[PDB]
Amino acid sequence: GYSDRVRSITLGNSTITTQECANVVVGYGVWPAYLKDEEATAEDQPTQPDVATCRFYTLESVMWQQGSPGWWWKFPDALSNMGLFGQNMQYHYLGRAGYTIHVQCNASKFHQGCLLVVCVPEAEMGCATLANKPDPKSLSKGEIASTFESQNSTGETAVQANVINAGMGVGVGNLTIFPHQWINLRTNNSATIVMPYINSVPMDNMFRHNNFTLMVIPFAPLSYSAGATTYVPITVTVAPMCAEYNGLRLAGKQ
Amino acid sequence: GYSDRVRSITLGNSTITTQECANVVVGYGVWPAYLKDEEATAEDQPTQPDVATCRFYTLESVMWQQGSPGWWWKFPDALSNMGLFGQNMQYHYLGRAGYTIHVQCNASKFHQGCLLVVCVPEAEMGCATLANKPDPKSLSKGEIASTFESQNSTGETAVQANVINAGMGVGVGNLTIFPHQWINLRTNNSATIVMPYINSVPMDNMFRHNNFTLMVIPFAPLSYSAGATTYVPITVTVAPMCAEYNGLRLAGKQ
Amino acid sequence: RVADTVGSGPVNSESIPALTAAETGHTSQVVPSDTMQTRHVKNYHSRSESTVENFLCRSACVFYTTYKNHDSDGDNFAYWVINARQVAQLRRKLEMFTYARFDLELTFVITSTQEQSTTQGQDTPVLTHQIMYVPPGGPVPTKVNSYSWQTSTNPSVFWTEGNAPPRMSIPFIGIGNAYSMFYDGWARFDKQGTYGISTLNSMGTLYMRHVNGGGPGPIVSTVRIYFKPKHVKTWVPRPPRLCQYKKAGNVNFIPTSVTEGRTDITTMKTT
Amino acid sequence: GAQVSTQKTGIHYTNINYYKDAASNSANRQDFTQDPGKFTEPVKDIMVKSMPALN
Amino acid sequence: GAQVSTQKTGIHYTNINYYKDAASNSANRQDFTQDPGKFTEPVKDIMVKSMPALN
Amino acid sequence: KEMSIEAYQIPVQSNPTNGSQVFGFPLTPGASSVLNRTLLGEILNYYAHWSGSIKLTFM
Amino acid sequence: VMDEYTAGGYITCWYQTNIVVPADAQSDCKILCFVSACNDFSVRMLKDTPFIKQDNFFQ
Amino acid sequence: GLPTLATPGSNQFLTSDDFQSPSAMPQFDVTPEMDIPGQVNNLMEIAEVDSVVPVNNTEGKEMSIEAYQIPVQSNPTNGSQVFGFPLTPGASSVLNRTLLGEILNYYAHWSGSIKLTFMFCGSAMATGKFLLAYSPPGAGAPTTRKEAMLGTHVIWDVGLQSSCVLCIPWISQTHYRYVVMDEYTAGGYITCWYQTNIVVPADAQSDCKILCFVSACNDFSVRMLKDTPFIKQDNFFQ
Amino acid sequence: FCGSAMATGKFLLAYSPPGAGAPTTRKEAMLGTHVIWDVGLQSSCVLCIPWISQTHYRYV
């Protein structure tokens, strides 16, 4: 009694069910796990919240439309405001963690469209204006998704959001090297990735560095005939995995 | 991970996939194979093209309509113009071969209709005019399907195409003794038969004799509500199996 | 070495090697043996030349400067802040990986040219240069002769024109367990200020200068720096740089088309 | 105290390191490791080619 | 890990390959193979000198 | 369309005729406006010789 | 590079059986295509990409 | 002649090379080695030694011995701060010039734990409890005894043991930190506060002085050699 | 779920222990114990309120 669509994931007080899936993409084949004494530098004992932090936080939803170019969410921060995760995140200088990203979107057998769900580690972005650097608010808005554009972005300090380049000066159609799954309304329902901690250092600050960005770009525009339900939302749900923290002190960010 | 609908057939550079099927009807239980030294008369060594000839040739398509009475294709000839098969067929006096017939037609869950796909060996047909014999062009038009009628055919040298008798003076509803499968839009998608060499002689000429005729007759008329896609094509794909040839010489046909 | 081909005959099954679900994100391990008949072919081809090591291990110019043999006020020496983003060639190569780790093979090509004057009776001796590396924090030179050129600790190279180009080896001097090619982060914990790789960047300056003035006639020497990664390690592949580069300190770019266009979606006559 | 390795052919070559810092050594090109399973099939679920990705 | 080969006379010489690509090696001149039967006597029929080429 | 994300969208629809062509490009992965700029294309453009089989997946 | 000596052939796609749709369902759709090499693929001869140029040192 | 192919780097002069070379004085008989006391093998054995830190390098005091005298006294309020400086041993006006600082300034990379020792130099009749604390970089710098206390700390009571050893542990995103001041490699903040005001009897000095010593722990190390920015020169000396 | 077999949708069923107020946002509610129920062929989802109390029993 099963279908390689069926699926039940549980972490803490949260639980995910999948009535339509492919498989589950797992980072670079590497499954997340706690930092070993052999790869560590911080000598103080780390905190491992566990259940209190490694659970499923569900960000604000977004509406998909026939013109929607795409969306993205920086990650170390985005959960900066989620329960005890965001907290341990404010009281500590260092932290490291893996994640279980689950993008959910559903239509009917009569709707059609296709989304690309990827996890770009170290997604440095360019500025709309060659001479400057894009301001923080343009880079990430926490749980509020940021948007790509179906054209060139404009001046001052915004990000060069034109989708064709994912704001990174590359060919949008090549993002497929990073961990990803496709949500093809016709056969899909949800996408699930398991990003492990990926960085050139055992641990890092969480407000100063975004070790990866989730992007949801539609390659096959949404469509439907008149009469069909017109509002098709997309919802991102993420869960920290094996979060450790070091260097405790007062809270904030400089 | 399977469905008795799923299906992948490969011969040469060609490959067939079946997302919706029943099974695969196999001749009279007999699977095609090369002529044994014990059943042979021609003493010269035969040619076995193999890959070059035993592959999938896909004939011209035909449009199914709410009135379509049916179609048929004589076979030894029909492939008389297909690559190296047709060639070996022109340069040799004798030849024998089996086949893998695959009729494909697809509609939506909202369309309905039902086709009968059969392989009538030795399908001798009558003339529309009692006193004469039906001319060649009326019998077969190579890759171009011939048509049955929803009434009596007329004069000169045409074939008595009225469907109720399959132009053979029998009850159309009894063709089911010959190898066949049904394409019931509601549950089907394709039909596949494996006709072995069937004849009263180890080998035969290929331009003078049609050892069998494929017929596609609709018993359940196609229908659909307004708005549904109106063009529903049918496509025949056939592949020679274990073709041998004897008596090489110049090419043509008397 | 590459995998050789397997002999394939005709098939008839419910097995669907031709159909999958790309939505999976898993790439198909489909060989030609499936979906078609094949002969047997013992393939000897080797991938030896596409190894990360070989892709990078080749000297490449990363920059170069100038300085005169003469000039009052000192001021006739040059410097350059080590970094690998001022050149298009190599940058794009290194930027095909997010993180990398490697040793570096430094090779310098020094040349001198003489400019027009009125000066006469010129019989110029050999030219000897000095390239001095200055780790970050070290005292930097001010004039062609400030004490700091003693290099009592800073390593440097002395070279006489006419000989084989100078060369040294540098170990993996990174602070972290690897070099970072990109950095979606800031310098300060209040996201104010510098954003980009430019923050991880900090590897000291390189100082060049003539040791001897040669003659009273005006001369201008140029130093070319060549990097060449060795013993390489690479992690997390990335889409090659599509848009042209615009700045050395950031990712900034101006939007570029995915490729070039053709007449129809059917034109074989490619652009 | 040298070492002999095979050459790149379709015979070996002797070699000794003369410097104390391993960074001084030449690039190791006789290397040949490879794992595509990271980039392709990074699914937690092993997929049989003959089977469908949905059942 | 060197190798000694005889010289061209009417005594040997030691030798070591210092490079990793066999293409870097010197020309092999100590070679001496030879088959004239390709160019002369390429007949499917062996001919006896004492005999005639027609009988 | 090379300036838009539509460059990747192959058009398909209901037709009143059979056999119509959908698209076509030459197996010239290295210098073809279509392929040359892919992951495979990009890599190829750093070399001069190539050999092997290719996988084209359609969704 | 594109050398007729080393021509590679042609890749084409055709309608085997027109796209059939019920009422109130989109007739036109889109197909995506992905390219990649098989386990017998290889490359030789290193060279700079013709894809990245430059005019002065960056800043 | 054995066939030779010279490679780049030939006839080159690399300050930090290391080859054999001909002796200008053959068969020279060197004077026998003696056994002088206190031999050093590594510059670290130096930096593991304590030296006084000029914490009160304030308003002209750097010219006097007072630079090392931390002021402390009886207060009419709790929580008042005693002092504070950043964990930037390499380029900090306070530290950089110590034994540890001096050594550091000859390198560019550093890693390890630090020992800050405090010595109370008030009358034996004086009492008081202090809160020595280190707050890693991330949030601002502590400005309350609270805040400071949410960090790594030790509460030092001044009993017969007049010397307290706080111990700044190594806590960084990276293994090493630049010796220069780079915000990427920020080091955090070191602060000290009154846990319980200085209590004194009659006829005993209210104000006293605390001395502070810095030194490295057994896990400390350094990398990348470079000249000190501390010693200049204009012409050859005479 | 008793809607037409052509209908779809994902729901978030959640239980938040007493202590703070009552959730008034999908967020807040989601910080509690929950299950996200997608309506596929399995039309019946089972949330399961676990026993969590300061005391063993609770008054009726």
Ligand SMILES: CCCCCCCCCCCCC/C=C/[C@@H](O)C(CO)NC(=O)CCCCCCC
């Ligand atoms: C006489 C002898 C003179 C020798 C002079 C040696 C000079 C040092 C040359 C080092 C070149 C390293 C190149 C590695 C690339 C990294 O720059 C990049 C690339 O995007 N980013 C980054 O900057 C990565 C961040 C890592 C920070 C490392 C800190 C040392």
